[PDB]
């Protein structure tokens, strides 16, 4: 469980990425992909992108990243009351798409990575000891729903 001050170290940051989602998803998913490469190959729409470049001129990925950090934004700001958020999404990455939570874990480093880089100014460590609080939440939770919808995950 996050403290008030957590969850408002969290939700500062995600003001920042508000400020321009499609560009922190681009980041956010470019280095999902290229830190860990057989992520992409979940993705059926743009698995075939072989490069960085292709991957930032991709419109399809763009809006993939837009959708992910939108989702994940009204999450946050339920401040851990995201059981109804969280159903969907849930059923969706396990039974559809088939996401295990070593993939969460690897999406949530890249999350970590890309606002280290662009928001020194609100991710200094007590900011990012939070949002890794928050992101642990996230994936313990996903991680009980999966095993309730039948996915071992
Ligand atoms: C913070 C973590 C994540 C959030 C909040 C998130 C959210 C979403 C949302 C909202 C959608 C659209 C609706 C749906 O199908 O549920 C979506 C689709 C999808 N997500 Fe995620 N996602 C996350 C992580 C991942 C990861 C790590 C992968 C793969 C490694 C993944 C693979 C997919 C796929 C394959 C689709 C379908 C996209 C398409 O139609 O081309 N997601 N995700
Ligand atoms: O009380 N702030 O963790
Ligand atoms: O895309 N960052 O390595
Ligand atoms: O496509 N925005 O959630
Ligand atoms: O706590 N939400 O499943
Ligand atoms: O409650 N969403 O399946
Ligand atoms: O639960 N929808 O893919
Ligand atoms: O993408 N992890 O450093």
Redesign the pocket.
Known sequence: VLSEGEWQLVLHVWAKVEADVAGHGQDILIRLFKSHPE?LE????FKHLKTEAEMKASEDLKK?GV??LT??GAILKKKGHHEAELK??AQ??AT??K?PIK??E??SEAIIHVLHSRHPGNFGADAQGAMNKALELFRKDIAAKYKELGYQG
């Open positions: 992520t979940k993705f059926d729409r993939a959708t992910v989702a994940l969907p999404l969706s990455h559809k798409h996401i993939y969460l690897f999406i």
